[PDB]
Symmetry: C2
Subunit: 404 residues, 2 copies
């Protein structure tokens, strides 16, 4: 099984070199199916970078972003927590050996039966943002530790009037008092700025709002110790607002509003930060059309029903990269890239500039780790691309250092 199969990365070789080698080797007769190269060492590097940048914040990996068993196994060996939204994710995380106290059930609107499953398996900490959720928790998980999720404003969100999650401050006061009535323990506050954040100052505002709700809990007699700053941190360097800028703003705000002497425990729920850049996708040009100055339509063997669903669900913009480095002098033409399916909406790239390519040539898409395979379907019978996991020796030694 390829899920638990890991390949060695030789010294002086990078995931890109491994990808090039695979492409060169299958060039004669093999079927040229799309495939991923996933560098678990990149995930270890991301964890090291997190420990260095946010020393007070325990990372809880958002499983929904990429639920690959290899990823969860590596992060579990790293002693990080896990953010789980459903019974299946809890089963996946526990099957690898993670104890329940390293799991947060961070879905604010949970089906009763899944709250029951969480209670049966010892997962005590859950989020909430509504009174009906308090009713359900009192009925199905009365001894749970609840974290109140508060609303954060995202100005660039598509639907600003209808917000799926998050209590306002005014609603937060009533929720805290109602939880007091039901003898339900509320232990903290969570918020999610989102991956669309353009100014880091929003984090500060969110932290300030969290402090406010913390004070409210003290007024109602609750003991508030848990602060959850959620996710949205970038997973690659190909972004305007980089991880270190965000952390640089976040650390002073944490020190100001939640000093360590208060006893607060600060955690986060990063998903794309850990895995985005670890996965590179290779697709093959399976068909070609020339439209008359000269423009091209290329059809590749992965699409919007597959890995590129992130184009619609995750508002992703994908940049095709040529596997064979192109000499500058050769002419570039206007081109479009399409998926394999018979749907006319299965279009990966509307317009881009590429040299003339041919059927059997390969295209690479970097930073395809996040919200790509996790949401892929088998529409039209096209199977999910095989994922090849690689890890160097030194990276494995680093993982061993973490396991201790």
């Amino acid at each position: 099984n390829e899920e638990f199969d890991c390949h060695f990365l030789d010294e002086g070789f990078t995931a890109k070199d491994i990808l090039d080698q695979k492409i060169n080797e299958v060039s004669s007769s093999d079927d040229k199916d799309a495939f991923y190269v996933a560098d678990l060492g990149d995930i270890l590097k991301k964890h090291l970078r997190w420990l260095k940048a946010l020393p007070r914040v325990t990372p809880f990996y958002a499983v929904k972003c990429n639920d690959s068993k290899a990823i969860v196994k590596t992060l579990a060996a790293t002693r990080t927590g896990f953010d789980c939204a459903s019974k299946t994710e809890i089963q996946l995380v526990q099957s690898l050996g993670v104890p329940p106290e390293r799991i947060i059930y961070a879905n604010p609107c949970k089906q009763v039966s899944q709250i029951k499953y969480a209670a049966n398996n010892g997962v005590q900490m859950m989020t909430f943002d509504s009174e009906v959720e308090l009713m359900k928790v009192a009925r199905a998980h009365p001894k749970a530790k609840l974290v109140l999720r508060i609303a954060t404003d995202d100005s660039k969100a598509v639907c600003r009037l209808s917000v799926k999650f998050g209590a306002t401050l005014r609603t937060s006061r009533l929720l805290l008092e109602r939880a007091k009535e039901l003898n339900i323990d509320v232990v903290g506050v969570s918020f999610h700025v989102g991956s669309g954040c353009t100014d880091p100052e929003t984090f500060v505002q969110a932290i300030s709002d969290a402090r406010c709700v913390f004070d409210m809990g003290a007024e109602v007699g609750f003991s508030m110790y848990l602060l959850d700053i959620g996710g949205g941190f970038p997973g690659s360097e190909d972004v305007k607002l980089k991880f270190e800028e965000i952390t640089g703003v976040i650390n002073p705000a944490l020190d100001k509003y939640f000093p360590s002497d208060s006893g607060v425990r600060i955690i986060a729920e990063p998903g794309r930060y850990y895995v985005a850049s670890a996965f590179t996708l290779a697709v093959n040009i399976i068909a070609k059309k020339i439209v008359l100055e000269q423009t091209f339509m290329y059809y590749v063997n992965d699409g919007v029903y597959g890995s590129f669903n992130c184009i619609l669900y995750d508002h992703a913009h994908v940049k095709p990269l040529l596997q064979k480095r192109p000499k500058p002098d050769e002419k570039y033409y206007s081109s479009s890239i399409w998926g394999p399916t018979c749907d006319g909406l299965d279009r990966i790239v509307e317009r881009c500039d590429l040299p003339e390519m041919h059927v059997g040539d390969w295209m690479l898409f970097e930073n395809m780790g996040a919200y790509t395979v996790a949401a892929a379907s088998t529409f039209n019978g096209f199977q999910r691309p095989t994922i090849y996991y690689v890890m160097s020796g030194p990276a494995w030694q680093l993982m061993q250092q973490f396991q201790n």
Copy 2:
């Protein structure tokens, strides 16, 4: 109602005087207290057989080739295979699925114009001879990997008025069609017909007439270069439920005279279609449970159900679907209606099924029904966030099974 082993091949009886809606009500009443209220489908295979009867009566000259991609459930493919229709397959997996149920290759058309070489080789290995194409590079690939194939040229259609358009992605113009036919002649590749798709949701039937006229022209083009053109494929786009402005019979009313005018039966032409939505749309009804609730202060409601845009309701984005929630429990005549929104289970803020609708106040544990959820819903659902696909319960009455026996004979 409880599935016996595996849903895929398990079918339940429909008693006399009972419809699919009645069965859905019985299942909901059964699970009123103890059971976990997971979302589920009721799929009436008898409705699919009735659709086949209606097709035979409306388009007697057109053999239907079911578009497996629309709903690839083994139960549907088995029922249609017993019906003796053809199958339109887009990939190796679909061909494997159809052949595993026992369908011979001459009842399969490989109607993907842009196929991976290895899948063309798989089609050649398993005896699937008929494939579509619309490009020169496709001719090069077929000459290399499937030289004895019977090729059908897919032409462009004016589908701007259609809900779902495949024109930009696929379809050769008449000008390009001439060059493609001559190129196929050079490569000694046999071209036997023409296919076209007017779009999944065309508003004006007249488009079919123009499409048929275009096909006639390309047929004549083939006659000029020495091809014997006999196969006409009029594609899909027929509505699958009565909840549409343009009904099936209007479209067939327009189509049949056009077929008689441009492709008379004495010419020897064989006419086929590739309907997917028509056969399965209304056969599936989806029941979801209200798993969470919020009240927003005049009074408005947000309901959270256990299926979403990553699941069955992906048709909202991919298929441009408009979904109408129906209350399982009949509403009181005078009870008040409130502005409400309906949301999916996942932690994604975009997982919204219904932005705004009017519903009476509902509670956690209540059920919501969505009719006509057969087409392009389960076929494209994912397990994002770990939420599983809803269980499908297949039902069939005795008379429906008798009708299936009639078709088989």
